[PDB]
Amino acid sequence: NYLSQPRLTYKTVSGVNGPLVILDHVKFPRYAEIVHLTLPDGTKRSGQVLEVSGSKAVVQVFEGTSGIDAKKTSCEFTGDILRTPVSEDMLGRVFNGSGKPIDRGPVVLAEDFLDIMGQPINPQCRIYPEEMIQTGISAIDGMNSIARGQKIPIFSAAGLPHNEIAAQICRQAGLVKKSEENFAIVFAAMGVNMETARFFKSDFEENGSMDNVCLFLNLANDPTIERIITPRLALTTAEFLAYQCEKHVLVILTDMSSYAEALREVSAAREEVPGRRGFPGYMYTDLATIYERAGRVEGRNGSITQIPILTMPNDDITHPIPDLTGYITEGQIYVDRQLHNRQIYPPINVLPSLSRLMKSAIGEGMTRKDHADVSNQLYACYAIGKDVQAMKAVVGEEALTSDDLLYLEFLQKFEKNFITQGPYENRTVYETLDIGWQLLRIFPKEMLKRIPQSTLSEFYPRDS
Amino acid sequence: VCLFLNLANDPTIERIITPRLALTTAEFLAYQCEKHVLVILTDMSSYAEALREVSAAREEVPGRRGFPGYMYTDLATIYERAGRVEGRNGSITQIPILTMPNDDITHPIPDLTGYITEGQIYVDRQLHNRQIYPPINVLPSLSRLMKSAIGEGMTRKDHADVSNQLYACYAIGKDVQAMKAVVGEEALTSDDLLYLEFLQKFEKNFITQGPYENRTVYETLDIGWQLLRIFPKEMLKRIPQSTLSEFYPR
Amino acid sequence: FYRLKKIQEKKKIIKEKSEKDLERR
Amino acid sequence: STFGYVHGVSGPVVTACDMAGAAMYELVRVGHSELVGEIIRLEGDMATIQVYEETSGVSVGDPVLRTGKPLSVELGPGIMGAIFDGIQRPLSDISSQTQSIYIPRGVNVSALSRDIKWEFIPSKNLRVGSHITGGDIYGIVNENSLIKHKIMLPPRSRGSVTYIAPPGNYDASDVVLELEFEGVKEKLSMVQVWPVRQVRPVTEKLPANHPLLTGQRVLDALFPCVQGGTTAIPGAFGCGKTVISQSLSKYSNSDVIIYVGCGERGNEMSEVLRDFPELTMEVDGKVESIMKRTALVANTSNMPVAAREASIYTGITLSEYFRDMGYHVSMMADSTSRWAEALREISGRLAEMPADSGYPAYLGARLASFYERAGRVKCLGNPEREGSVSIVGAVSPPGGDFSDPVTSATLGIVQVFWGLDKKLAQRKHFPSVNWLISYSKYMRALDEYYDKHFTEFVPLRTKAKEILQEEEDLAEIVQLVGKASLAETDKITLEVAKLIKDDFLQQNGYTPYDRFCPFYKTVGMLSNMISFYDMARRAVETTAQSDNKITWSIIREHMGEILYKLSSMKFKDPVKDGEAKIKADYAQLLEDMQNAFRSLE
Amino acid sequence: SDPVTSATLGIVQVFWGLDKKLAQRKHFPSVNWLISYSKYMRALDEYYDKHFTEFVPLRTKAKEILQEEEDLAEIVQLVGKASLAETDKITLEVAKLIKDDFLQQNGYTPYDRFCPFYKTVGMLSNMISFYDMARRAVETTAQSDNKITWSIIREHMGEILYKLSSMKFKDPVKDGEAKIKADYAQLLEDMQNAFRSL
Amino acid sequence: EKKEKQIEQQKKIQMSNLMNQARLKVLRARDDLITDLLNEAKQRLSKVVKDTTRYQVLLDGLVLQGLYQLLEPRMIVRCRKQDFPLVKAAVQKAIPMYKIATKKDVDVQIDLEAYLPEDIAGGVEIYNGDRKIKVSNTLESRLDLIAQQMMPEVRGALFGANANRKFLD
Amino acid sequence: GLTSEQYHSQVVGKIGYIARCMQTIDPENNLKKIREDYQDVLIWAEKNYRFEEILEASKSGKCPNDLDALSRRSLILQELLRLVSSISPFKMKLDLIESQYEKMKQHVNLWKSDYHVKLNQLNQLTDYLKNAAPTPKNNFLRAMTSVLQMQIAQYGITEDNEGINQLFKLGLHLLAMANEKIDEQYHLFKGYVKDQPEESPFEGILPAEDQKILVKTMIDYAMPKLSSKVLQDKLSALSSSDVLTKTLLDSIDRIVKENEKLN
Structure with a gap:
């Protein structure tokens, strides 16, 4: 079973060239093998075999190549590819982008060792998503509901509060508590500035929630190969927790546009030609390898749900990163600069947002019987209210009908009561639905065209 | 009839010799056996697409939209294999057929072809959708050799004048129809309504024909004068007095 | 793209002629 | 020797040596875990292999084993009810045998089971010394209750029979025929192998004539497809694609169904593989599963990119194999855009010139x-027979932009467009087909079929499309004219257009009487609606010149019972009403409306 | 747009963008208040709570006025201002006061070479106090025979508009904190007395 | 009304922090118990070095396991000074086995000038002829490489299997 | 289209197939007016030529080698051989067979002939009965299909005999009918037996044990409807017949009409 035989060490460095060290006379090189370098001053560094040919191996060093020489620097080849130790004891822990602890706890005792690249889930085994993940945010739980086993991105842009929303979902998410126990969160963050990395670590300890959370931090000035490794450590931990320890896992991946930045940087070190709009030609396959590590599978009670968080340049949805993500994932939640400028939080615009699997999350025995009706009627009234608000400055409010004035009253109360929420306020799906009924009661019930008379009879009147 | 067939499932690189086999056969028949040959080359856009695919593998310099930098020269070696020659009776006429990608006449295939060939006939989706046959929109169409193949002794003395006046009234009729879409019918003067009546009668009488109708030039010319007759003669400013005073009063 | 290829090809030719000179050393 | 050795590895590209005499696009097995790849360059004794799977941990000096074949399909008994990926890996056997939710690197389960024994019957008048040629049926395997799996001699094989098996039960590895040509023998089991990129040959290729029935009134009447036809559908979320797939699978005059996923989202693929095994149809008065005549090719967006690109070539080669048995096969491709993106990734990995919108130069040729x-x-x-393959292929234009190279090439090629439409689906109008955008070009080919079998239908289709166009032409005018001041002829056009749009084009497939609307019911309904239109037009036109003229209000007041009987025609039910009963009822409405109009004339 | 900007925005906590419309209208400093951002505001709000208390509401309302007017500034290009309500005219005209007499700042003149934070909060506190009272006068006289308009307020309160636009001229080298606060507080009383006189 | 509704979460925040802090203490204890398992293993391994009959059988293995990794024409063996009589016997036993198993001629020579430190627990290092490549078979290298790899079986044996791990796939 | 190595191999194969068809349809050379239309292919297959001598003779143009002529000539013999293969226990007279052959040879395109449609419908109705176990539906289909094959063996396929055409409509409608609809199956089959011109449709067509099973399976369906044992006993006396005739149905129905008056 165990590898048993002794590691070779080499002083055969032939050349050093940007992030790459080239060695020669290497005995049967292994592609993607991990190697350890010792510098002339006794400093230790690490690398991965980026390519092999005959007796030559080329190593990308994770740290810089600075201070490396040809004569004195030496390299030890570990005999194996990158594997992670994994266990249920990773919940309540904080790690860097290469799996070292950064929480003053001890190193992980493995329950197993796993290749971080994993294996694809068999299409025959994967079963269709079902009941809701309650995020605690009314603009998501009410109108963009998330199914267990869905994968659904958040689209954002520079300066918007997507890290605060990500931290709020991480602090609040769970199962709906109809009529936590088997839940876990894996939070992975790529290219994070130190102020944001401190915000996550501080806010999850301060607000108590760490016992559900495994946290991986990669900072903006950490090695960029740790940014390639980070999603794969995170999803290798989510696959153990969901498909062996039977938990329902929520995985949050923070700024996939910071991941794509590092993927391009690795591709350029291989001397590959830049593909479309600057990114690698295989970037669809590369993202799909992260995103499709998701879903429910037959014969197991656990599941993985994913929320990839993205930043769009020029706020332009047609850029390769948000474009290719839309072909692999099944929805989008859309963070909006006009709501942010008007000082609304969370600034989520419900009109361009969608959850494609919402019909499988909502309804009787999974949330409440009226959820499907109330979501459709709220969307309709918000769409109509936005149209009346636009014409008010064209015709003047004295031209408006009494029907238009009900919609323009709804619009203002929807954005104040339903969309606006505190960053430390937690609403169940039931508070989310009940705030919905307090707004629909602005209208005479005969104007509620999307709601059937059976639902209106039970829910429109105020109860004693 | 001689047929060379390369179908959609046949090898792509045969397509770059197929028109050269056909034109070599036309050159023997025309310039040694003295025949009059009509050569039909079906979808030159399939030839250009096969040429792009071949050249992309050699990494030769690209031109516009990724076609080979020499595509003009290459197409010219096919299209210049036409015409009459000294002391031999035979001749080669070429009618290559093109598919324009997304209907764009500025695409390199119709573009570099129009730079070489002696005109084009243009088939229009907007006339085809209106159920007209043939869908030939005259405005983007041309013939260069027309200017000397027509007129006195060739066809009839009016042919060069009538043709130019039909182009002028059709261009103006299109401009009035484009004005109508902004301002509506109540803005149009009676002079605008004359061009907009010519437009309707031209597309029904002169263009529309049906698949087996075989008009003489003289029928085509007199169907020309009838549409031009709508206008008071002082509006016919492409036509000189000596032509108007002979053919308009009939 | 056409200039990022061709630069790869010129580098490949230089590396081949370099290695094929080491076969003379 | 069949073994070469790994010289170098860099990404998915492996370079191997001692590969002398390996051939272009052969497949190989690389490494001790036997990863699949294909040969993309040759140079001296070396080859460059494009590996399909993860090359992590492959080492210099690892073995490379050459397979004597390009990418190819195993064709034989055991395809019906199978789940395959784009390179024919049996996903339902890989799960069963591995006891795992994943697909292993270098998994090597054979596509068809060599374990199961198949009940084989020879051709009964074949004997030793018989002369035999490619495509000759030499036996039948009784695969299930629907499909006789006809065992055929491979194309490019011929000779004199030296041996043929007696009737019995055999493995897919048992030799069941042997023959000789030029003193050289060939031994054959039930399974043949064919390259995915080579068109399977035929004696003659024929014009398409007979309709492919869907059981939908729209589609089968307004926009018909032929058996052997080509079709596109808009593949987008709200449009309701499943009505096409389920109509083909349950009710069409296909014999066999092949479904291809090209590169779908993980959870979208799971809904197809959930739903398809649960579908049923009724055959000889007994309910049968759809999977007795169906095979699925399935690819999620993380399957190897070479499988995503091979997917349609596997599916068409499987279709052409059942065509050759003399069956009629329907193929569905779940999105051809997801295939063209895999074609773009592969040509991008090869660093080919980016032509149009980053797609390779050959996109339209493929x-x-x-x-x-x-x-x-x-x-x-030898046994004289005809068969066909029909293709339906979805396509996914970005934001509905048909100028996209894949969509533009697709609509430049296919002869039918069934324009499913979200804006109609949001009205609960089902099926969602946009009758103003949708079209079929097969109407000159289907002419002599309808002329023989139905005869009156071609005029009825023509008038129906005109009524449905006049009600578009009137749609602006009504807003200015205010409905009331319109001509009575044109009020008749608007409210017969409403009758056609509400009671002919709509078809609720969950209701027991309208799951499947046979073509005699479909012409019967349209015949009565157009008969009422002609009579209403004639009643106005007979009187409008100077009489106390007929009006559409007078017709609705005098004939509202007949106008309700016309809306009642869709509820007639082929499960409980005979063909003669439905014909008699639709004839009785034609007598009743004549008596009513003759009471007004 | 460019790679250096795109790379920088992934890292920096504050970004100030230029507006060519402001620079070519010779408005300074020419910073765009709709594409710019700062991610430090939650960290600083405890300092503003400790040392000022009023400023966080003022910052919030000023950004609302500047965004609300940017939508009105699109619609008036179609309709030529005539349809606009008095509350919304009030919002155009006060947005301009903020743009010309608070956001605009001469960089060379001694009184505005460096605007200290007690001057900064003082100016904006008065402009937002004016916005509340001016808007309240219009809204409180809807549904009435006498209805207040921006023109009525402009006619009644021209000295208050002159004092508000002049608040920038206070020189922190010549005048102390106490005088600058007292002058702004007297204007707040002049505003209240003028609105009470309407 | 919001504050009066937060009270459940407000205290349960402390409970999840306290339970995770208690667990941190338990994880530090468990790590030290593993650390002392490796300390005992290292002390027991020193007795296998003192038993010169067993230690010879290790030198006979550790030398040849080096030679099979290098496969060079010439190799330099380096050892602790006092182990030299065992190492010279081990090299003499290794050369015939190496030639039979590899089909190469070889030149294996002991470094007489620069021994390993006497602080080393035991075992040997082997170098190619010019010292550009080495392989290390010191007994702490052996123990550490095995002990890291069997850590999942050590966790399972010392502290019991995880009750939640339903599946091993 | 085909390569030359395909095209000549398909000619050699198709010459062999016409011979295997001829040896299947006529083991005796009785159909001589047919054979004289095929002797120019059969004269090759009558000798050993190892495949390979026919391949060279086909390339040499010595064989007939127009595949479209060979295809037409093969289809006619195949569509004849299907008819005689479909008529299972019964057989046609030689001049009837040579008439069906001539009626086919004159047809424009057999793939669109009414003959081909009727043969497909006969094969569809037949192959179900190679597998189907005993039920009312399956016994009625064995009875009707035996009469259908028998009438086809008297009258041929090529001309619209109303009895054959009616029996196709009845047989195919019963095949399509749901297996649980025993009341409609019995009503349809009693409908056929009552709508027959003769007293006894099955007279020497159908073996006596199967006739006894029809008499029995009608009695077993009628008896549970009879509420009085006197009527059950009067019905039971009819089980004395093995032959199935209108008299049985008329008597069963008479006892049921007595039950409808008794209740």
Whole structure:
């Protein structure tokens, strides 16, 4: 079973060239093998075999190549590819982008060792998503509901509060508590500035929630190969927790546009030609390898749900990163600069947002019987209210009908009561639905065209 | 009839010799056996697409939209294999057929072809959708050799004048129809309504024909004068007095 | 793209002629 | 020797040596875990292999084993009810045998089971010394209650029979026929192997004639497809694609169904693989599963990119194999855009020139060569027979932009567009087909079929499309004219257009009487609606010149019972009403409306 | 747009963008208040709570006025201002006061070479106090025979508009904190007395 | 009304922090118990070095396991000074086995000038002829490489299997 | 189209197939007016030529080698051989067979002939009965299909005999009918037996044990409807017949009409 035989060490460095060290006379090189370098001053560094040919191996060093020489620097080849130790004891822990602890706890005792690249889930085994993940945010739980086993991105842009929303979902998410126990969160963050990395670590300890959370931090000035490794450590931990320890896992991946930045940087070190709009030609396959590590599978009670968080340049949805993500994932939640400028939080615009699997999350025995009706009627009234608000400055409010004035009253109360929420306020799906009924009661019930008379009879009147 | 067939499932690189086999056969028949040959080359856009695919593998310099930098020269070696020659009776006429990608006449295939060939006939989706046959929109169409193949002794003395006046009234009729879409019918003067009546009668009488109708030039010319007759003669400013005073009063 | 290829090809030719000179050393 | 050795590895590209005499696009097995790849360059004794799977941990000096084949399909008994990926890995056997939710690197389960024994019957008048040629049926395997799996001699094989098996039960590894040509023998089991990129040959390739029935009134009447036809559908979320797939699967006059996923989202693929095994149809008065005549090719967006690109070539080669037995096969491709993106990734990995919108120079040639395999055929080999493959292929334009190179090439090639439409689906109008955008070009080919079998239908289709166009032409005018001041002829056009749009074009497939609307019911309804239109037009036109003239209000007041009987025609039910009963009822409405109009004339 | 900007925005906590419309209208400092951002505001709000208390509401309302007017500034290009309500005219005209007499700042003149934070909060506190009272006068006289308009307020309160636009001229080298606060507080009383006189 | 509704979460925040802090203490204890398992293993391994009959059988293995990794024409063996009589016997036993198993001629020579430190627990290092490549078979290298790899079986044996791990796939 | 190595191999194969068809349809050379239309292919297959001598003779143009002529000539013999293969226990007279052959040879395109449609419908109705176990539906289909094959063996396929055409409509409608609809199956089959011109449709067509099973399976369906044992006993006396005739149905129905008056 165990590898048993002794590691070779080499002083055969032939050349050093940007992030790459080239060695020669290497005995049967292994592609993607991990190697350890010792510098002339006794400093230790690490690398991965980026390519092999005959007796030559080329190593990308994770740290810089600075201070490396040809004569004195030496390299030890570990005999194996990158594997992670994994266990249920990773919940309540904080790690860097290469799996070292950064929480003053001890190193992980493995329950197993796993290749971080994993294996694809068999299409025959994967079963269709079902009941809701309650995020605690009314603009998501009410109108963009998330199914267990869905994968659904958040689209954002520079300066918007997507890290605060990500931290709020991480602090609040769970199962709906109809009529936590088997839940876990894996939070992975790529290219994070130190102020944001401190915000996550501080806010999850301060607000108590760490016992559900495994946290991986990669900072903006950490090695960029740790940014390639980070999603794969995170999803290798989510696959153990969901498909062996039977938990329902929520995985949050923070700024996939910071991941794509590092993927391009690795591709350029291989001397590959830049593909479309600057990114690698295989970037669809590369993202799909992260995103499709998701879903429910037959014969197991656990599941993985994913929320990839993205930043769009020029706020332009047609850029390769948000474009290719839309072909692999099944929805989008859309963070909006006009709501942010008007000082609304969370600034989520419900009109361009969608959850494609919402019909499988909502309804009787999974949330409440009226959820499907109330979501459709709220969307309709918000769409109509936005149209009346636009014409008010064209015709003047004295031209408006009494029907238009009900919609323009709804619009203002929807954005104040339903969309606006505190960053430390937690609403169940039931508070989310009940705030919905307090707004629909602005209208005479005969104007509620999307709601059937059976639902209106039970829910429109105020109860004693 | 001689047929060379390369179908959609046949090898792509045969397509770059197929028109050269056909034109070599036309050159023997025309310039040694003295025949009059009509050569039909079906979808030159399939030839250009096969040429792009071949050249992309050699990494030769690209031109516009990724076609080979020499595509003009290459197409010219096919299209210049036409015409009459000294002391031999035979001749080669070429009618290559093109598919324009997304209907764009500025695409390199119709573009570099129009730079070489002696005109084009243009088939229009907007006339085809209106159920007209043939869908030939005259405005983007041309013939260069027309200017000397027509007129006195060739066809009839009016042919060069009538043709130019039909182009002028059709261009103006299109401009009035484009004005109508902004301002509506109540803005149009009676002079605008004359061009907009010519437009309707031209597309029904002169263009529309049906698949087996075989008009003489003289029928085509007199169907020309009838549409031009709508206008008071002082509006016919492409036509000189000596032509108007002979053919308009009939 | 056409200039990022061709630069790869010129580098490949230089590396081949370099290695094929080491076969003379 | 069949073994070469790994010289170097860099990403998915492996370079191997001692590979002398390996051939272009052969497949190989690389490494001690036997990863699949294909040979993309040759140079001296070396080859460059494009590996399909993860090359992590492959080492210099690892073995490379050459397979004597390009990418190819195993064709034989055990395809019906199978789940395959784009390179024919049996996903339902890989799960069963591995006891795992994942697909292993270098998994090597054979596509068809060599374990199961198949009940084989020879051709009964074949004997030793018989002369035999490619495509000749030499036996039948009783695979299930629906499909006789006809065992055929491979194309490019021929000779004199030296041995043929007696009747019995055999493995897919047992030799069941042996023959000789030029003193050289060939031994044959029930399973043949064919390259995915080579068109399977036929005696003659024939014009398409007979309709492919869906059981939908729209589609089968307004926009018909032929057996051997080519079709596109808009593949987008709200449009309701499943009505096409389920109509083909349950009710069409296909014999066999092949479904291809090209590169779908993980959870979208899971809904197809959930739903398809649960579908049923009724055959000889007994309910049967759809999977007795169906095979699925399935690819999620993380399957190897070479499987995503091979997917349609596997699916059409599986279709052409059942065509050659003299069956009619329907193929569905779940999105051809997801295939063209895999074609873009592969050509990008090869660093090919980016031509149009980053797609390779050959994109249109690959799509034309694919759809060209559709058609009716006269099969190879001795028992005289005809079969066909029909292609339906979805396409996914970005934001509805048809100028996209894949969508533009697709609509440049296919002869039918069934324009499913979200804006109609949001009205609960089902099926969602946009009758103003949707079209079929097969109407000159289907003419002599309808002329023989139905006769009155071609005029009825023509008038129906005109009524449905006049009600678009009137749609602006009504807003200015205010409905009331319109001509009575045109009020008749608007409210018969409403009758057609509400009671002919809509078809609720969950209701027991309208799951499947047979073509005699479909012409019967339209015949009565157009008969009422002609009579209403005639009643106005007989009187409008100077009489106390007929009006559409007078017709609705005098004939509102008949106008309700016309809306009642869709509820007639082929499960409980005979063909003669439905015909008699629709004839009785034609007598009743004549008596009513003759009481007004 | 460019790679250096795109790379920088992934890292920096504050970004100030230029507006060519402001620079070519010779408005300074020419910073765009709709594409710019700062991610430090939650960290600083405890300092503003400790040392000022009023400023966080003022910052919030000023950004609302500047965004609300940017939508009105699109619609008036179609309709030529005539349809606009008095509350919304009030919002155009006060947005301009903020743009010309608070956001605009001469960089060379001694009184505005460096605007200290007690001057900064003082100016904006008065402009937002004016916005509340001016808007309240219009809204409180809807549904009435006498209805207040921006023109009525402009006619009644021209000295208050002159004092508000002049608040920038206070020189922190010549005048102390106490005088600058007292002058702004007297204007707040002049505003209240003028509105009470309407 | 919001504050009066937060009270459940407000205290349960402390409970999840306290339970995770208690667990941190338990994880530090468990790590030290593993650390002392490796300390005992290292002390027991020193007795296998003192038993010169067993230690010879290790030198006979550790030398040849080096030679099979290098496969060079010439190799330099380096050892602790006092182990030299065992190492010279081990090299003499290794050369015939190496030639039979590899089909190469070889030149294996002991470094007489620069021994390993006497602080080393035991075992040997082997170098190619010019010292550009080495392989290390010191007994702490052996123990550490095995002990890291069997850590999942050590966790399972010392502290019991995880009750939640339903599946091993 | 085909390569030359395909095209000549398909000619050699198709010459062999016409011979295997001829040896299947006529083991005796009775159909001589047919054979004289095929002797120019059969004269090759009558000798050993190892495949390979026919392949060279086909390339040499010595064989007939127009595949479209060979295809037409093969289809006619195949569509004849299907008819005689479909008529299972019964057989046609030689001049009837040579008439069906001539009626086919004159047809424009057999793939669109009414003959081909009727043969497909006969094969569809037949192959179900190679597998189907005993039920009312399956016994009625064995009875009707035996009469259908028998009438086809008297009258041929090529001309619209109303009895054959009616029996196709009845047989195919019963095949399509749901297996649980025993009341409609019995009503349809009693409908056929009552709508027959003769007293006894099955007279020497159908073996006596199967006739006894029809008499029995009607009695077993009628008896549970009879509420009085006197009527059950009067019905039971009819089980004395093995032959199935209108008299049985008329008597069963008479006892049921007595039950409808008794209740």
